[PDB]
């Protein structure tokens, strides 16, 4: 490259930088969906609208177009060549910045051995939780759905492990009937969100919810209620019931748990192996780098493969997710 | 554009994301001196001898890799494209991510009107001091020194406003033997951090230190010491005299408090008007678009220029500095 070529990468880099910010700042604060709605907007009248300090707009709106994702005219913003792309993928410059901004921004100190003990990364859980809510939605939803269309039986009692929201129950609970819903989850206010949204939701007496660790649900003492259970539902949590070694324990203690479950629908994101670095795509870096900051396993999609048996299950069925990064919905019975 | 360009464009915004926050933390743990040097080092190695966690710092070159910084041959990371310029402009970056990154992560928190009060944002001092110190060095040095070099008198009693670690009274003080440096900054552990510093180095009983905000210095006490000084200096801060009035004020207050004042260097950058969108260089957008988050005032190259005569001081010479934005350096008298 010229002078000249390195000039503009360098600074397309930088720019870039506050672009990807800005993106998940712009869908948090609604400016994306108006522009989807009306390909146009006009930025005092946004910033009047909002209420928002109109200054503060302007550079989140210039961020947007220095890299193409918006085009500035006049007193208007317009959609630009990426914008499409931009916003489909949203959630996850969201999850990156606002979610795990802090972690990333902290890497001189978390790279050092001597600092990696006791609380040595911060996350905004708020964020994480903000944008996980879409990605569940965007990205894991049509592999999902294929799994609950391909289960050959009509479930009865579902039960969720790390439920969060309870939003996936609610939406097995529309789509089944009088199906009931039990979500296990580590948090006392996941759960508290959960039982509000279900009683808004009509759904109260249909979905409850129960404080646990999935990664040893030997300890949750709700056996009975885990012995109704023929649908077993895992998204975007797996990953945590590594190393190998604790995996195959979690799996084995997961199938005595729910001796009724027939089907174990497991979703999640997976460590890449072999993609050039000049080809990473969306997520894959930063799920995989993130990680590797906070020290904790992230395992390949072979190495999911090769657990199962003797975790107690078998694969009968195993979906491709597009395209965040490489995710999977496995089907084990 | 097609779906596979704009796929392209918008995963390496998301990338260089870590590339840029990756380049701060490589210039910090050592990594890019050693590469500049030897133009390759081997990953393992680096992180034992830096006592690193290396799947953290395999991520880290992976970043920096997947936007053309480095290159990843096997066990070695070697030089790539755009390694010159981004090394060249490595505190920039540690600027944008280290420094003032929460600034920027908050984005949907800072704008919002209801929460401008009071404490809104949070930037890291040290980190920004950190920078600040490369920056100073790297692109302000050779228009200061030549600024020093046309002065057409030997200082006897210098004052640096906005004095920081005292790095511009000591570099003076080494230029011209017994010359005396008084350093007036408006934080109470910046004056002890220079106390130290100038101490150690041999330079206590020639350079001291006086707590005081220049924009009110008629108010600020030094012993009757500002009535000796014949050379002022004031680097990287002018635009917090803005907006215009009291810009107008303060010179007036530093021209009556500092009467024996020959020549005033004032070193800044500025903010730029007319870049298109997506010709921005490198720290043009972050600096004036993080301003702008914080409400504060920053001024162009013209409104310097129009401010001097009625401040009371008169431009003698103006020196242009590459490329920082739009940077320079007055020499006023
Ligand atoms: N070991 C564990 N046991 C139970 N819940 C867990 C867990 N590890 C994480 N969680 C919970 O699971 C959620 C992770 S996010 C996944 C949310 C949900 N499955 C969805 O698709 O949106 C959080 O609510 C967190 O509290
Ligand atoms: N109004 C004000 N009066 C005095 N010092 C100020 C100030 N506003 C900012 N500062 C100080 O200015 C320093 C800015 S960093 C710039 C440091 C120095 N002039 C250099 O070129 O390297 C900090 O220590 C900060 O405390
Ligand atoms: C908390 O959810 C996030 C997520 C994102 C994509 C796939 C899986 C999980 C992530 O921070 C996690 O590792 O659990
Ligand atoms: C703290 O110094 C920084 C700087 C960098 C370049 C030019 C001017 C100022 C910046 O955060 C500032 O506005 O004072
Ligand atoms: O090994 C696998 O590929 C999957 O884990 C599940 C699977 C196996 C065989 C046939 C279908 C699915
Ligand atoms: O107006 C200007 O450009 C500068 O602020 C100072 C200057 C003016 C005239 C000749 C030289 C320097
Ligand atoms: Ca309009
Ligand atoms: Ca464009
Ligand atoms: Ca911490
Ligand atoms: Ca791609
Ligand atoms: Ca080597
Ligand atoms: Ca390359
Ligand atoms: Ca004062
Ligand atoms: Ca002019
Ligand atoms: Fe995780
Ligand atoms: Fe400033």
Chains 1, 2 share one sequence.
Not at 265 to 293: K, Q, S, W, Y
Not at 314 to 332: G, N, P, W, Y
């Amino acid at each position: 490259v010229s002078e000249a070529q390195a000039r503009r990468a360098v600074a397309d880099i930088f720019n870039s930088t506050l672009a990807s910010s800005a993106i998940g700042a712009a869908w948090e604060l609604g400016a994306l969906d108006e522009l989807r709605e009306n390909g146009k907007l006009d930025v005092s009248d946004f910033a009047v609208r909002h209420d928002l300090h109109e200054p503060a707009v302007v550079g989140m709106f210039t961020a947007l177009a220095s890299v193409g994702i918006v085009r500035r005219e006049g007193a208007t913003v317009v959609v630009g060549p990426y914008f499409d792309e931009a916003n489909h993928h949203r959630s996850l410059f969201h999850w990156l910045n606002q979610g795990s901004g802090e972690l990333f921004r902290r890497m001189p100190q978390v790279l050092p051995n001597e600092n990696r003990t006791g609380k040595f990364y911060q996350l905004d859980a708020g964020a994480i939780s903000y944008a996980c809510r879409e990605i569940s939605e965007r990205y894991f939803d049509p592999a999902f759905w294929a799994a609950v269309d391909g289960l050959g039986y009509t479930p009865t009692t579902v039960a969720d492990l790390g439920s969060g929201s309870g939003e996936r129950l609610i939406q097995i609970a529309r789509r089944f009937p009088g199906v009931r819903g039990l979500g296990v989850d580590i948090a006392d206010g996941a759960i508290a969100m959960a039982e509000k949204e279900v009683a808004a939701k009509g759904f109260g007496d249909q979905i409850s919810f129960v404080r646990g660790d999935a990664r040893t649900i030997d300890q949750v003492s709700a056996r009975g209620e885990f012995a109704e259970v023929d649908l077993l539902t895992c998204f975007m949590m797996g990953h945590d019931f590594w190393p190998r070694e604790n995996c195959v324990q979690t799996l084995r203690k997961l199938r005595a748990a729910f001796p009724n479950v027939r089907r174990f629908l497991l979703g999640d994101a997976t460590r890449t192996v072999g993609i050039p670095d000049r080809e990473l795509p969306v997520f894959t870096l930063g799920f995989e780098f993130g990680h590797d900051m906070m020290g904790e396993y992230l395992p390949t999609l072979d190495e999911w493969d090769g657990v199962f048996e003797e975790g107690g299950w078998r694969c009968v069925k195993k979906h491709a997710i597009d395209s965040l990064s490489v995710s999977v919905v496995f089907e084990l019975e």
